[PDB]
Amino acid sequence: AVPFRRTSKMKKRLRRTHFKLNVPGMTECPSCGEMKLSHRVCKACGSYNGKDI
Amino acid sequence: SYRKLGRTSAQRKAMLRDLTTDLIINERIETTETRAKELRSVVEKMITLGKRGDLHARRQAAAYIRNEVANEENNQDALQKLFSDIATRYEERQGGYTRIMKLGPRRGDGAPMAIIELV
Amino acid sequence: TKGILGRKIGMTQVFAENGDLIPVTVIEAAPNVVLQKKTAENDGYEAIQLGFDDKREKLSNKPEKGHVAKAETAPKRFVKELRGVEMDAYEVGQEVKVEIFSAGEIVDVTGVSKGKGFQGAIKRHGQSRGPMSHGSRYHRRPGSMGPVDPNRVFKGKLLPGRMGGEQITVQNLEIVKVDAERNLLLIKGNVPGAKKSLITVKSAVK
Amino acid sequence: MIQQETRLKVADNSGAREVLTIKVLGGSGRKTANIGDVIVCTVKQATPGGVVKKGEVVKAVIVRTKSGARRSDGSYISFDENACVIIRDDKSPRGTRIFGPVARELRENNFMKIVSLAPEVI
Amino acid sequence: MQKLIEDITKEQLRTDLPAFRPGDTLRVHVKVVEGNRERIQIFEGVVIKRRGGGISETFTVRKISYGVGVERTFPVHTPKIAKIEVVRYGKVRRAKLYYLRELRGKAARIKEIRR
RNA sequence: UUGGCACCUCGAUGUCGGCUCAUCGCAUCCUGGGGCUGUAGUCGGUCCCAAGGGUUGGGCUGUUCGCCCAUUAAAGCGGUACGCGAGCUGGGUUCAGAACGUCGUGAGACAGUUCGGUCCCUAUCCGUCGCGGGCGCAGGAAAUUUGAGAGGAGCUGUCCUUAGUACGAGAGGACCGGGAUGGACGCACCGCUGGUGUACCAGUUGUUCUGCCAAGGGCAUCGCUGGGUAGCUAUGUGCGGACGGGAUAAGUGCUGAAAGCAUCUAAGCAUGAAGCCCCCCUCAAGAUGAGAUUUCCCAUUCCGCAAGGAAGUAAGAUCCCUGAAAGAUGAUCAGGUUGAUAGGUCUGAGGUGGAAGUGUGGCGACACAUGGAGCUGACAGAUACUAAUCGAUCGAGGACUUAACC
């Protein structure tokens, strides 16, 4: 229940390949321009689907 | 199916019940999205009861909702508000009494919050 | 040899000139259509395709549209391929229906089992559990992995995994009834798979 | 769905009242035997010293259960207890009468003797 | 699709039947076969249970015969049943009378209603 | 096996038995096929080929083993650290306590006994079971597929007939061949039976709360009790292991010489098993040997002498979103505004069982009618009411040589 050997740098990195972050699904705010998540609200425009809250 | 929300039956009922009352009062609230998804059904359901307006429905909805104020200067409660105001609002609509606009996540949870409305 | 393919709906009971119940499975096979007619000269074996759907054009694609437009029909969703049948009988654009069969023909049917998910050794492989008392800290577990000498674990040792979703056949079933007006088959018993799922029926491989 | 170490009651004028099961006379390992089936048994409660006696090994036939039986027509039948009848190295009984109702599955198996002895068959 | 099921099973459904309730005494003239000599048999008892939909509807009748409790379940729409006939309805507060399984001896009695 | 020797291990290789999990050998327990018989038949004995599959549940004992009861076609012998303790138990052996017998002056001791006595570890690598991503497969894509090759399955009784025939003096009682029905095992499924069913229904107790009655809510294991849809389920249902082919084992032989005969053998021919390869089922082109078929897209722009590179795209796919028949997550599948993907709404099914209010009768508890009522989570049918918006990203331009058509 313990490592029989110490893990090398190479395998450490090979494991940490997939350990990463994809970017968001991004879109502009057509109202005031800046970027935004898809299907979500522009925090700065305060707008969504051509409608302000 | 239906969700559990990391709670027991009793305390999720209490959650949803409080939230229904809070939404009836404020006509808009910010929560998590999943909680909103689970509200949407029961909330439109109580609105059906309001559209009925019968006393049987009054007593059902009273069994569900909580005894809070919804409008000072009127001594009004959530239940009276529900039936009178909201049924007078939605005589004509057949379901879909809500909107769920997704917001981004939260700082502490990373939890996707979202607002919910009465449309 | 013969065959058809449709979609499962559900199950019910049916009598047979008696009080004798029949647990029945219900299938709708809207008239399937031929799409391609393979040969040993080009395809290396004799066989045909069959389509079962009427999709939307918003869902289909150009190559599908051409591949069916050889025939005078619409894009299809469930397309599969029969083997070892009479070839001269069939043609392209040719529809096949339930009145092939009758109310006593035996059948081998085929489908896709339900998805049970990542389940354990017992439910997946029918193993026995350990005792739930007498001091045991062992139950619902798969067992030993093997002996010591080979310093390893043999293949085929059975373990948890995604139970379900397998292509399954069931042999020697019996057709009970047909409703060609509704494009329906009523088969004695039960089949693999969930409702709304594809089911390929075949003359039984006796 | 009786099995070994089931305690049944007898339905004849043989002298036994309660009985216990040892085995189902089926195959290698048969777990259960609903009705029309045969078993090996011992007497546990009996009358005064009539024919059959305490702690005596016999074999017997099942005539009713509450793990009811099924029929090809979907007509099922279950009773409120689990009872049996004793035989003589053969499909014939030894008790001269029968107490209680019986099922029709004892004609599939050829216990028509018992069927005739019965008051009622269902 | 259950619409479709009903559409295809309406033929085997029946219309000769009365309405009966869980808890009412009832005879049934079921058919039997012994040696190619068809006969009938009268099972007269009380309805413990009724369930199911359409053709799969099923119901259970309980009786006592020679001191022994008996239950006999039938699907509703058999041709095998020649007939059923109520003798008395019953004032009962339930749908499934599994307590009568346990009880007997003039406590397993049902107050008639004269519907 | 009892052992002998002390070669690894005392900076630790956990030791009996049992549970789960199996696996291998065959000197085969059953099933299959045969020879011989002091084989009449039925049953048997012995030997040969065969390891495909199967090879019980209990009592006593810690036990292995063994005896016993009842079954079974049979209740096989062994190996795998007397398989398997980072998988379980820990009853026994084998710590410390105490006791009996016995020995000892005594402290104490006994393969003598008895009672009681802490079983740790988040799995790094390989391995195994499942699941994804990346790249490749001389252009890019959507589908269907071949099958090398792999795995699975592979058991068996009883009854009827043949026929009470053959055999037998009789008792008794067949081979073969037909047919039916079961056991165990496995696969699938929930229409039945039943179970479960914690956002369904009803009843009911105590307390408390909604100002009070009525009606209801909270807590009390879901408060308890009686039912219970979907789904998941077995004990329930359906189905299977059948038909058969090819080559063989032991065996049987035909023809036939060497060896004027005989000879199953050297030449040459044929039979012949639950076994081998197939037939049955499943996976399968990473089968780098990367396959085949059908259909779609076109062969653009910039540099760069060319080599080659990037930079917008087509077909198409994805991000993202609604969701489940799917699911740990990815994935898969159905859908994404000319659409029913989910929710909601309305119809229903099914379940519960006759709501609240009102009235009547009753002192009252309560009953009757209104009224198969009211309520209802996932079930299916409609319905564009709500949310699946607007976007964005990736994705081809198709090397050379040779042969044939041209």
Swiss-Prot record, chain B:
GO biological process assignments? translation
Recorded GO CC terms: cytosolic large ribosomal subunit
Q: Name one GO molecular function term.
A: structural constituent of ribosome
UniProt key word Amino-acid biosynthesis? no
What keywords tag this UniProt record? Ribonucleoprotein, Ribosomal protein
So which residues are the signal peptide here? none
Do the record's keywords include Ribonucleoprotein?
Answer: yes
Q: Which family does it belong to?
A: Belongs to the bacterial ribosomal protein bL17 family.
Q: Which PANTHER family match?
A: LARGE RIBOSOMAL SUBUNIT PROTEIN BL17M, RIBOSOMAL PROTEIN L17
Q: What is this protein called?
A: Large ribosomal subunit protein bL17
Q: Which organism is it from?
A: Bacillus subtilis (strain 168)
From Swiss-Prot, chain C:
Give me the ranges of the annotated region Disordered.
121-151
Purpose: One of the primary rRNA binding proteins, it binds directly near the 3'-end of the 23S rRNA, where it nucleates assembly of the 50S subunit. Strongly stimulates 23S rRNA precursor processing by mini-ribonuclease 3 (MrnC); 20-30% DMSO can replace L3, suggesting the protein may alter rRNA conformation.
Entry's Pfam families?
Ribosomal_L3
Tell me the GO molecular function terms. rRNA binding; structural constituent of ribosome
Q: Do you know which PROSITE patterns this protein is assigned to?
A: RIBOSOMAL_L3 (PS00474)
Q: Which GO terms describe its cellular component?
A: cytosolic large ribosomal subunit
Asked if the Swiss-Prot or TrEMBL record annotates the protein with the keyword Chaperone, the reply is no
Keyword RNA-binding assigned: yes
> What is the similarity comment for this entry?
Belongs to the universal ribosomal protein uL3 family.
Q: What is this protein called?
A: Large ribosomal subunit protein uL3
Question: What are its GO biological-process terms?
Answer: positive regulation of rRNA processing; rRNA processing; translation
Q: How does it assemble?
A: Part of the 50S ribosomal subunit. Forms a cluster with proteins L14 and L19. Interacts with RNA helicase CshA.
Superkingdom of the organism of origin:
Bacteria
* Source organism: Bacillus subtilis (strain 168)
List the keywords (alphabetical). Ribonucleoprotein, Ribosomal protein, RNA-binding, rRNA processing, rRNA-binding
Curated annotation (Swiss-Prot), chain D:
Q: Which GO terms describe its molecular function?
A: large ribosomal subunit rRNA binding; structural constituent of ribosome
Q: What SMART domains does the record point to?
A: Ribosomal_L14
Record's GO cellular component terms? cytosolic large ribosomal subunit
* Record PROSITE patterns: RIBOSOMAL_L14
Domain of life the protein comes from: Bacteria
Q: Which is an annotated Pfam family here?
A: Ribosomal_L14
* Record has Metal-binding as a keyword: no
Q: Which residues form a coiled coil?
A: none
Q: Which GO terms describe its biological process?
A: translation
Which UniProt keyword terms apply here? Ribonucleoprotein, Ribosomal protein, RNA-binding, rRNA-binding
InterPro entries linked:
Ribosomal_uL14, Ribosomal_uL14_bac-type, Ribosomal_uL14_CS, Ribosomal_uL14_sf
Which CDD domains would you find in this protein's record? Ribosomal_uL14 (cd00337)
Whether Ribosomal protein counts among this entry's keywords is: yes
Q: How does it assemble?
A: Part of the 50S ribosomal subunit. Forms a cluster with proteins L3 and L19. In the 70S ribosome, L14 and L19 interact and together make contacts with the 16S rRNA in bridges B5 and B8.
Tell me the function of this protein: Binds to 23S rRNA. Forms part of two intersubunit bridges in the 70S ribosome.
HAMAP family registered for this protein in UniProt:
Ribosomal_uL14
Task: State the family named in the UniProt similarity comment for this chain.
Answer: Belongs to the universal ribosomal protein uL14 family.
Q: What is this protein called?
A: Large ribosomal subunit protein uL14
Q: Tell me which species this is from.
A: Bacillus subtilis (strain 168)
Q: What is the lineage of its organism?
A: Bacteria, Bacillati, Bacillota, Bacilli, Bacillales
UniProtKB/Swiss-Prot annotation, chain E:
The keyword Ribosomal protein appears for this protein: yes
User: Which keywords does this Swiss-Prot/TrEMBL entry list?
Assistant: Ribonucleoprotein, Ribosomal protein
Output a single Gene Ontology CC term carried by this record: cytosolic large ribosomal subunit
List, alphabetically, the InterPro entries matched. Ribosomal_bL19 (IPR001857), Ribosomal_bL19_CS (IPR018257), Ribosomal_bL19_sf (IPR038657), Translation_prot_SH3-like_sf (IPR008991)
Care to name a GO molecular-function term for this sequence? structural constituent of ribosome
Enumerate the Gene Ontology biological process terms: translation
Superkingdom classification of source: Bacteria
Self-association state and partner proteins as the record states: Part of the 50S ribosomal subunit.
Q: What does this protein do, in the record's words?
A: This protein is located at the 30S-50S ribosomal subunit interface and may play a role in the structure and function of the aminoacyl-tRNA binding site.
- Family (UniProt): Belongs to the bacterial ribosomal protein bL19 family.
Q: Which HAMAP family match?
A: Ribosomal_bL19
User: Would you tell me the protein name for this molecule?
Assistant: Large ribosomal subunit protein bL19
Origin organism of this chain? Bacillus subtilis (strain 168)
Gene that produces this protein: rplS
